[PDB]
Each structure stands twice: as structure tokens, then as C-alpha cells.
Symmetry: D2
Subunit: 392 residues, 4 copies
């Protein structure tokens, strides 16, 4: 397979552009020119690109410099036909953000953070972005007493309400997606899982403008089931965006190519996204790859790794399709009663009164006999893996 713009594969400028300076060593690669990055991505099939303000414009560029950069950027976008679906702001690199942006203990830092974001919203709106992604990487703590969480969530909410206001007033029409992460770089990060971020969003002034941008590895850093969490995000209708990558459980942030960590979970994720209700995908935003080319690689390895993300997604998609169209899989699903979960437990018009009255629901229920019937879940799981292995 080959990707089409229909696939909606995007990459962050900072993925293919990571110079591979890790916590223990120097960069192994030279910087990638953003224009060059646009051309290369277009060429591999990406439909869009995303970036943090500071990825494009060096922190502290004068207006002439910044203006020049933006202009060339837009020219490259025009020429390749790539779009900018989302934009984001770097609130974690500069020493000033060492205790966070929106929730730094220092009031002046909080005011500055908001201004940095507003400035990025303007640039996003001008490039046509539809969503503003917010990754509060420095919002959190290494020690429990250093941060008042309640005060922190109030401050977080306070900054976000202002951003929605500004957008709505300017008629920018942006949506906002909060990106959860459990830890790294802070010992513990606020809004640690997709669950925590959805519950928070529900407390904003204009909740309908807010959703989440969950990332594969972030949920796997807590050993959570990524597909299962995505399923819940879809049930809430809060999956505004998605970051795809690979990770090997609880350890530092690996940012591997999507599919290179937990393959089986990658497989069920692609099944959930594409084999949505009514034939169609359950999700229609960008399929964003938020990964990093391993430090052992050079620029050839960088493009290889970019192509690997798309290949991995398309291969899994193919196998998910085949899986569902297999009459033996259907038979297994029927035997496992997967679809029976979709039928209400209560009959149409039945309330507690009638249920209470139904002797077959309690008084005459043979718990023991039902408890002895197998669900055939293992056999179903085996068919799924055989499809993934191209054995069926």
C-alpha cells in the first residue's frame, strides 16, 4: 500500500527534526530545515504537518526574522499542498517553565505562558489550523508539598477559559485538545491519563470546545490499555486528535514508530478507528505520528522511520479489514456474544418494577448453569492474531 491524503497522516516538525540529543548524550544529527521537512513529508504521503511555535521560529527571533520564516513556511505549504491541521506551543523547554507554564507557582510565569499561547493561536488561525493542542509537560511536581493541585487545576482552568474566549471572540473557530501524560519530565504530571483529562475538560466554561489528544506511549507508560482508553474517549465524544507511537510499558518515553512497541494493541487500535459503526471510521481527524527517529540513525534512517509509521498503519488496517470480513471470525464473535452487549439490558419500557417482578431474572435464574458456559474468548483472540500474522 501507499498513503493518500484521505489517510490523513500528519507528523510534527519535531519528530523527523529531533537531533537526538537525549538526557545522556549529544545530538547525533544536524538540524532539519522546516522547508526541507515540508518537502520530504509531502513526498512520503503526509497530508499535513504540525509544530510548536519554537520549532519554526527560534525562541526570541525578532519580528523581521519571524516574519521571514513564516513567509517561506507558507510558500513551502502552498507548493506541496500540505496543510496545518493543529498547532501547539512550547511551554516546557525554556528554563522559565521549569515549574510549568499555566500552573507555575510564580504568577508572572503564568501570565507569560498565556501570552505565548495567544500569539501561537493567531499564527494557527492564519495557517488555517482547526485545533490547538496543549501538552502541559511541566505542570506537576517531583515532591507532593511543592504543588497545590486544587490551586493548580483552578489556574489551568483559568487560562483555558480565556483561550476559548479569545478564539470565540476572534471567530477563529478553534477546538482545544489537552494531551495527558503520567510523568516525564516532571516526577508526576497533572491530568495523567486520558480519563483525568476528560473529567477536567468537563469543568471548563465551554466544554464543547474541549477534547483530548491521547498518545499511545503516554497511556502505556502507566501500563494502561490504549485501545480501551480510546474507546472510552470515543464514547464521550472527546477524541479531538490522536498521537500515534510505540512504547515498551513503564520506562522512559521511547517514542518508537507506531506498531513497534505493543503490536497487538496497535492492531486493535487500528480496528477501532477504521472499522467504526456503519462501515465508516469511528474517528475522522488527523492520524498524527508523535515519534522520534532512534538516536542510532542518520538522515536515511530518519526518512525510513517516517515511512515505517505509515506502512505500519496501512498493514494493520488491511489485516483489521480482513479480520472483520472473515465468516469464521463472525461466527466466533456470535459464539462469544460480543454484539449481545449492544442490546439494552432492560426491555423496551421495562423499569425496576417489572424487573423486580421477573422471576427469571432472580428467583428462577440458574446462575450455576449459565456460569458453566464458556465464552470462547481464546479462540476469538487466536483468529485475530492469525489475521495479524497473515496466517489466514
Amino acid at each position: 500500500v501507499q498513503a493518500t491524503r484521505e489517510d490523513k497522516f500528519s507528523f510534527g516538525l519535531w519528530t523527523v527534526g529531533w537531533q537526538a540529543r537525549d538526557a545522556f548524550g549529544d545530538a547525533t544529527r544536524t538540524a532539519l530545515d522546516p522547508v526541507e521537512a515540508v518537502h520530504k513529508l509531502a513526498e512520503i504521503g503526509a497530508y499535513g504537518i504540525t509544530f510548536h511555535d519554537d520549532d519554526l521560529v527560534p525562541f526570541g527571533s525578532d519580528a523581521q526574522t519571524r516574519d521571514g520564516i513564516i513567509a517561506g513556511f507558507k510558500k513551502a505549504l502552498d507548493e506541496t499542498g500540505l496543510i496545518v491541521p493543529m498547532v501547539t506551543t512550547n511551554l516546557f523547554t525554556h528554563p522559565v517553565f521549569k515549574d510549568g507554564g499555566f500552573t507555575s507557582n510564580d504568577r508572572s510565569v503564568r501570565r507569560y505562558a498565556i501570552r505565548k499561547v495567544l500569539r501561537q493561536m493567531d499564527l494557527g488561525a492564519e495557517l488555517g489550523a482547526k485545533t490547538l493542542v496543549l501538552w502541559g509537560g511541566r505542570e506537576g511536581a517531583e515532591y507532593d508539598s511543592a504543588k497545590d493541585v486544587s490551586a493548580a487545576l483552578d489556574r489551568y482552568r483559568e487560562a483555558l477559559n480565556l483561550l476559548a474566549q479569545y478564539s470565540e471572540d476572534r471567530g477563529y473557530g478553534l477546538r482545544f485538545a489537552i494531551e495527558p501524560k503520567p510523568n516525564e519530565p516532571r516526577g508526576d504530571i497533572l491530568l495523567p491519563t486520558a480519563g483525568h483529562a476528560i473529567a477536567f475538560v468537563q469543568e471548563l466554561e465551554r466544554p464543547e470546545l474541549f477534547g483530548i489528544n491521547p498518545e499511545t506511549g503516554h497511556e502505556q507508560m502507566s501500563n494502561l490499555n490504549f485501545t480501551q482508553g480510546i474507546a472510552q474517549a470515543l464514547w464521550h465524544k472527546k477524541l479531538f486528535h490522536i498521537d500515534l507511537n510505540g512504547q515498551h510499558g513503564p520506562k522512559f518515553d521511547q517514542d518508537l514508530v507506531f506498531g513497534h512497541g505493543d503490536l497487538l494493541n496497535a492492531f486493535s487500535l487500528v480496528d477501532l478507528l477504521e472499522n467504526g459503526p456503519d462501515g465508516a471510521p469511528a474517528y475522522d481527524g488527523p492520524r498524527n505520528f508523535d515519534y522520534k527517529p532512534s538516536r542510532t540513525e542518520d538522515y536515511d534512517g530518519v526518512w525510513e522511520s517516517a515511512k515505517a509509521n505509515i506502512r505500519m498503519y496501512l498493514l494493520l488496517k488491511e489485516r483489521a479489514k480482513a479480520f472483520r470480513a472473515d465468516p469464521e471470525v463472525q461466527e466466533a464473535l456470535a459464539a462469544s456474544k460480543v454484539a449481545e452487549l449492544k442490546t439494552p439490558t432492560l426491555n423496551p419500557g421495562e423499569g425496576y418494577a417489572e424487573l423486580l417482578a421477573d422471576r427469571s431474572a432472580f428467583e428462577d435464574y440458574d446462575a450455576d448453569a449459565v456460569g458453566a458456559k464458556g465464552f470462547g474468548f481464546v479462540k476469538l483472540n487466536q483468529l485475530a492474531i492469525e489475521h495479524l500474522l497473515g496466517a489466514r
Copy 2:
């Protein structure tokens, strides 16, 4: 120290009554008599007792026996002065619940689970319980293709809506607390964290009636910060109840005495619960110990371990108060700007327009000078710890 009824220490009947039959070996202790349990716990200082229907009344007890049992139990309560703050239902032991109660693929099991709960609701109502705790231990899966999560959430919701309805109509006045857990016994349990459970409750028909019952060990099973998650729950006003115990990170469910796992996090948690605003506790519900006396112990070790839960909470409370009252701590708190997070980021009446007009928040802001100043967090953490060690 000594526990008072005002401390509100409660224990589940299944805690001191755990016969220590684990996944790999037989019970090392004989069955605990419920009346004895009531007597024993009243003696150690508990103010209330909780139980699952099946802890008290053997599954499949005839009306006569059931009544018999309840009546004796009520005497014990009477005699002792213990109350039943919350009640719960066992939807995980009997083989019929191997795929869940409320979200079992099998529709007949779902109907049965509802009926089983309704009945405990009545008993609870009759015993004066104010909360119904729901632990969906078998709601989940071992294999991704075996459970439609979205359908399961719909069915979970459908069952809860009905319980609320019934409670309201019978005038039971119950509140409902969902207990999240990441895994064990299912490979992955639905509503894996406090966050996922709060997000869910928010989608119910009478959300004001639902909250959560987070457990120390459940959150630590995913290596999450328990204190920080409880802080978020209180922010949301969804801490209906709390289960206290100990755990040593991501491994099987250990159920150790509270403070026997992550000691630093038990300290910070007691601090958060008791050193609430207006001097007073941030939480006024039962401090329930949901733990297990280790298998190597006999009944002496059983009572020893029950008392240890109370001693641990009281010893930590004592140090948390001393911590807060220390002038040097007050000095560290100030240097760390912990309270500055409570002051709004914006001046009263300021909106994006005025913030954009402030050159000092961006254009003339010296991020470099601000980024060079330290927060003094390590010194603050060291003082907290010396207070915990009784070294100050």
C-alpha cells in the same frame, strides 16, 4: 494515640475475615464469625463496618436463614454502637460473573446482576447505609476483541441510571460510589483510574448522585500518585468514599496495611485529607481500610494488622499537623511560592484584551532572569521528611 468515633475508621468484613486462600495456596485461617468481627472491630476503635451481601449471608441462603443472619447482625451492631456507612454487592465471585455483572456479554447475567444489587440496596437502606459502593471487578477483558467498550459503558450507564431511579423512588437517599481498578482479576478492568471513573459518572442521568471510591493500591498498581489523584477528585467534589491500603507499585494486588507500601505518599495523603481549608479536613467521610492480613499470620496477626491500620493513620496525622505548624516549613512554603498559585493569574476584571495590552507579560518580560531563580522544593521536601521521621 487512641482512635475516637470521630476519626471514622471503618473496615470491610472481608478484610479481617480474609481466610488467606490466594491464587497459589489454601486458606491458612478459619472463617471469621460476623458477630465476633463486629465485637472485635468495635474493640479496636472502628466506628463502622461494611460488607458485600455474600460476606454476611452465604450465597444461596433461604429466606429463613438470611433473615436469621441479618437479625443477629443487627443485634451485634446494637450491642456495639457500630454503624454501616456503606454497603456493597459481590458481582465477582460466582462463576456466572466471569465476564462481568453489569457488562457481561450475556444479557441474562446483566439482568441477574441488577436484581442482585437491588436486593442489597434494600438491605443497605434498612441498615442505615448512606452509600452504595460498586466495584466492577469482572467488567473488562483479557482480549481486546472480546468486549465492545462503548457498548459496555452504555450498559454500565443503563444499570446505574436504574439503581438511582429506584433509590430516589423508594426514598432511600443513597449516593453511589464507583470504585476504579486497572486490572486483577480481569486483564484490563473498565474505568481503570479515578480519572476514568469521574469522567464516566459525569455522563449519568443524575450525576449529582454519583462519585468515586478510589483505593490507594489501585492507583499505585499503575504507578500513579495517589495523593495527586485524590486532590483532583476533591477538586471535582467526587470523593464520596476512600479505601486505604498499601502497595509496592505495579505487581499483584497486595492489600497491605495503610502506610506499609508507599510511606511518603501515605504521609502526603493524610496531610491533604486532614489539613484542609479553614483548619478543618478536606474530607469528612469514612476512612475505610480495605486491606488483608498477610497469609503468614494467624488470628493474633489478624487483630494486630487491624490495629496497625489505625496506628499508621494517627501517627501520620500527628506528623502532618506538626509539619504545617513549623515556622521553618512556613518559610520554605513561602520561598517555594506554594500559596502564590492560589492567586489568580489575571487581575480582577482583566480579560484577554487587557492581558494582551500588558507589555510586561510578554514583550518586556525577562524569561531568562526568571528562569535562573530556584524554587527551593528539595529543602521543602527534606523538611516534610524530617517531620515524618520525628527528627524535628
Copy 3:
């Protein structure tokens, strides 16, 4: 694909025989007769069976019963052609072993554990078993002050040394395999990893008679790389047996079918065992499956899962073979310099002085230039997954 006796797949009687009584619920399956188990497994393609003394003969059977059971068992093996390659002893189920067998703090329990084992050694020898597997599931602790580790290691060694003495003297010719596990059932188990077990064995009196029996899920419970750990056991020549199963990182012991956990690692493992030096396998013992049919299944599901293990292993082998046989893989391997690690760092007869005199090894070495060339590892890995996926 079809299994042959030369594949040497074995199953423990306790695998397919697990009644599914977990820590939270009652058994969902009836007991499996050992004889039926023998016919069933011979039937799905296994070449041998393994068992715990107590799996075959109920703890506390008189010699008449015991003898009767052994004779029937022997007939079954007889009629089916299945062998008993290894035997083990249950030193974890009975309450007496709550603090361990060989390392119980109680001296009487230690003497008893040894006797229990000596007897199982007699049975194993009579059945033709060649290896005695020892899984010290109860050796360890929940609390640090409860167990003197040093004393524990002396006592573990004392017992093992006697076992070797006995076998050697009765001429049983047995080999001993220690099975490492990090936790469950004890909070922490002694000799937690393949490394710790190997180091320990090196200290015995007849170390040549001792090795390890590492299990997939055991090493994954610590988020360790199973394949890499086996590679090290092979380098030391201590891989005497191997238990295969699946697990999803650090959580309770799942014991899923082999390959249903970390699929990518299951792949690299088959590759390591089968594509040994010179086409031939690097390992020659039994490929034992120590898994459990999920609690949600009935006997149909049980036989299904037994076959899933064999299937998984043969599908993976087929793909690992193809991977290595692929000229493009062979080319990527050359580019990544994988085989270059086999060339000694030093020239033949080169020592520190010749090395110190080689200016090209340091003085004239261009680290910057070498530092910039990529290893092409992403590409090589992408090739491996495409083979696994059957896309190549």
C-alpha cells in the same frame, strides 16, 4: 502447520487442568482426570507431560491410592507414547509452606520440604524424567525485617546440595533447574530474575548439575526483555528448560497462551531458539507451555488454548525462518553491522601494549566522523515486523 514429537512441546498437567479458581472467584471448570489429560494432549501433538507431585497424587493419599494412581498414569503414557521429561514438587500450596519450603524460618518445615522433594525425585527417576524443576514460589517475603536473605541463601544451597548428592549417589542422573520469579505469591521472591538464579547456582557444590528454567511472563513481570535474558542464559549454558506463556507487563501473573502477550518479543525468542548457529536450534530441551486457559472458558476453550500455544510457536518459527532467509534482511543485517560484533575487538595476539601503540585506536581516531554514520536499525526492525505480519 503440524507439530511433531521433534518439536518437543510439553504441557504441565496443571495447565489444561486449572479449574479457574482465581483470587477473586470460584472455579468455573470441573477437575481434569490425569489419564484423560494424557490422551487429550497426545492428541493435540504434545510429546511429553510434566507435573507437580500433588497434581497427580492428592496431597495425603495413602500408598495404596498413590500406587494405584501412578500405575494408571503409567499405562496412559504407555498407550500414548508421551514421555515425562521433567517433574517438580508442590512447595507452595499447603498452608505449611506459607513462609517457604527450603527457606521457611521454621526449621521443621525446611526438613519436611526436603523429604517431600526427595520422594518426588524417586517418582521422576522411575518415570524417566531427566530434570527436576524447582520453583521457590513461597521463598521470600512481604516485609524486609522478616527474612534474613543471606541465611535464606545458605539454606537454599544447603538443601540443593543434598538433593544433588542423593541423585548422584542413587545414580538418577538428574539435572536441576531453578525457576526465577520476581513476585507472586510473595511480595518479593528470592532469586527474582534469570540473572539472580544463574549467579546463585554458580555457588553450589556441583554447579555443573544446575541451571535455570526461566519463564516468559516471570521476566516480563519486571518489564525485562525475555529474549535478551535467554540469550544471556544461553551464553552461560544454563538454559536447562524453558516455560513459555504470555503476559502484559508488570501486573499479576496472567499466564496467557504463548505469544498472546508481548508478540514482538515472542517472535525474537523463537528466532533465538530456532535459528541457532549452523541452521540448528540454539536450544534442545522441551518447549514447555506453563499457561492457563482463561477463566471465561469451558473444556472446549481449554483444548482450544492448548492448541493455540503450539500454533503460535509454529507460525512464529515459520516467520523467523523466512526473516533470516530474506536477502534484503541479510543486506540490512550487513549494513547494521550485527555480525561485526562477532569479530574480536583485538587483533590476534594483540595485548594492551600493541593497543596503546595503535594511534588509529585513539590519537588519530575521528570520533566525530564515526559518530555521524547511522546503523540503519529502524529499517532492519521494520523488515522483521513485515515478516512477522506476513507482508514480505
Copy 4:
């Protein structure tokens, strides 16, 4: 409590000198001058300093430069009375080491790695160092097919045998300590735990010269019991050095101050090292703090955090002593039979033949009765914790 030279606290130059440049942000502190560090460390009570070659002399310094730094360095040592008990080599920062030093797939880097190390050995020898620590941080892989583990161990061994030959010919009298780490910076690092490292070492040519340098946080990254691993290292007599710090389970490398992570295990660890065999410590080497002052701190914070390390150790030492001196603990120890483990299982001159003849060890053994007695481990643990809290 104040530190003495007898306490033997040492710090690596790179601990206090860490500029806080992490994987996600710029450095928040300026460079620390080495002479300054020696002076500041002498002042807080450290008895020695350690360093990587590159921490002292910038990579690629000419000889004049290199020579001047050493001379200055030695003068500071001289003036303060501080010693250099161990030295190490940076085989992880420079890009040339992206695939490892001693086990790089590239043969020229391997040769270069050995030369860089021999050079550091000469300087260590000149400074009086007695141990060479080797942390193989870049040895491992991100992908299984990228690294031939067996060949990697051969090359690791080839290099170490050479280092030993050199030291021994020259009369340096060094001892070598391998430092294990499960991951970070590599996805999986070779010799991941203390056990893997000890087993490896037993395979070298002059094993008596090799041991390990385990680090608190490195074992905890795998959720292993650090005290228990140290106990096993002591039993093998391979504890040549120790790195102390704090960590909160499996997540990125935190490098907190000793005791700021798992406080309970920090306590049992100090009890193990100090309440040794006679009355005397079980370990006699340096107590090295390999930690990092949090990114949120300035140099005031740096010096505070250095002191905190020493303060945590001395406070725990004090409590460990008090614990063991308590008659109630002695009583709890007696009831738990801790000391009974130290008594051989067999009576003097008893072998399998005499054990087999003892009907009481099996035939007449009342296992049911023994299994019913408790060990009182919880009560013992509760006494330990109360000593820790200064509650007794």
C-alpha cells in the same frame, strides 16, 4: 547528626555539577568548577569525590590543558583532605558511543572505548583510586535483531580481561565494579539487574578482581527490592561499591536524594549495611550519592540537596540502630523465627540417608498443625515503621 570521614560519604562530580539540561529542556544552572565542587563537598562532610574523565577534562582537551586541570584538581584534594576512591569513564555522551562503547556493533569504536578507559585507569592510579566503575549505559538495543547478545557478552568480557591484565602487570591494584541498569538511555541495556551483572562477572578470567556497583534507582526501575538484591550481592561478596539515590518505581531515571523515593526500602537498606555481622557494618566501602539536584533548583538548592543525602543516611542509621536495640523488637524477632533460619536444616553429620530415616521429617510430620501457626510478620513490620517514624 554530623558526618565524619569515617562515614565515607562520596559524591560524583557530575551530581552537584548537573546543569539540569533534561530530555525536554535547556539547562537551568551554570557550570560548576571542579575545584569549587571539591571545596564545597569537603565543607558538607564528604570524604571523597569521584568523576568521569570528561567531567574533569573537557572532551578533546589538549595535553597542556589536560595537565593544568589535573594539577589544579590535585591541589584542591590536597588542601581539603578529600580522596578519590573510584574513577569512571564516560562511554555514553559522545555520539561515537550511540551503539555502545565495548559492545558497539562497530569494531573501531570498541577499540577506541578501551583506549579511553586505559587512559582513565592511569589517572585513577595516579590519584590513588582503588576501584574503576564501569557503567555500560549505551550497551544494549532498541530492537532485538540489532544486537547479538552472545557476541556482545564475548566482547564485554574480552575488554574487561584486558583492563585487568593491564592493571595487574602495572601493579595498579584496581578492583572493577560493573554497574547494572535495566534501561535508559537504551530501550534495554545489557546486564540489567544486580544478578545479571554478578553472573557475568563469574565468567571473567580474574573474577576475584570483579564485583558490582548497584544503584538504588536502577533496581527500582524494574520494581525489584533493592535491599534484598544488596543482601544477595553481599552473600556472593561482590558488593565492591554502591550508588545511593531515590526513585519512584518504573518510570524514567529520577536520581532523587537518597531516601526521597522508597523510604521503607531506604530504611531496611541502611539497617543491612550498618547492623552487620559483628556489630560492625556488613559493608566497608564508600557510600556514594549518585543523584541529581532537581531542575527547579538553583545552587542554593544544589548545596541543600547534597546535605540532604547525608542527612537522610545518618537519620535512617540512627533509627535502624534503635530498632535493633529494642527488646520489643527482639521479642518480635524471636516470635517470627528470623534467627532460626541461620541454624542449618540438617544436624551436624546428617545427610540424605539420616534425613530419609527420620519419620518425624515426613511420615509422622503434622503439616496441618504447623501450617496453622502464625509468624507474626505484620507486628514485626509495624515495630520497624514506628522506629522509622521516631514513634518509639
